[PDB]
């Protein structure tokens, strides 16, 4: 959920990046 | 011992992270065991695995030079 920083959409919520939301194309 | 209504208690085979415990002598022969110690896992012949002692230490070290 948007409050678990350890999920994809979690990190999208705070709009940060990381292991669970890496920046790539 | 009273005859009837009593468990058999027959010579058995116990296994573990180690080899076999030959002694046994219990009802329900051939039993499996999580971890037996006295073959020296678990604090006997203590390995003290994943030990630390770093509570004071860590901020004494990396902070030493940095």
């Amino acid at each position: 959920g948007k409050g678990d920083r350890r999920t994809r959409r979690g990190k999208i919520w705070r709009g940060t990046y990381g292991k669970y939301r890496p920046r790539k194309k | 011992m009273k005859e009837g209504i009593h468990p058999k208690l027959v010579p058995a085979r116990i296994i573990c992270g180690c080899g076999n415990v030959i002694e046994t002598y219990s009802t329900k022969p051939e039993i499996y065991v999580e971890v037996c110690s006295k073959c020296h896992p678990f604090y006997t012949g203590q390995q003290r695995f994943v030990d630390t002692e770093g509570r004071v230490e860590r901020f004494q070290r990396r902070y030493g030079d940095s």
């Binding site: - | 004494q60 902070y63 940095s66």
Partner: protein
């Protein structure tokens, strides 16, 4: 948690006076307004009077206080409960 790991910041106001108290032959009570700094190892066994905003609180210093700031041992508020 938190951070530095390059620079390990501590004020040089007192670090001077502490280093000078290392090899002096004397140990006494050093009044400081610096809670921003970090404590030890050359600090340990020394008594520092730290400011909470109101006064300087005496604090004895020992080894398990290591990585900690000097303001942690000088709390700023006064509570004693509600009722």
């Amino acid at each position: 948690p938190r951070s530095l790991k390059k620079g390990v910041f501590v004020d040089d106001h007192l670090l001077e006076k502490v280093l000078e108290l290392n090899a002096k032959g004397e140990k006494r009570l050093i009044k400081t307004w610096s809670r921003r700094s970090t404590i030890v190892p050359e600090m340990v066994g020394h008594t520092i009077a730290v400011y909470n905003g109101k006064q300087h609180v005496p604090v004895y210093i020992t080894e398990n206080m290591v990585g900690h700031k000097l303001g942690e041992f000088a709390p700023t508020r006064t509570y004693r409960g509600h009722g």
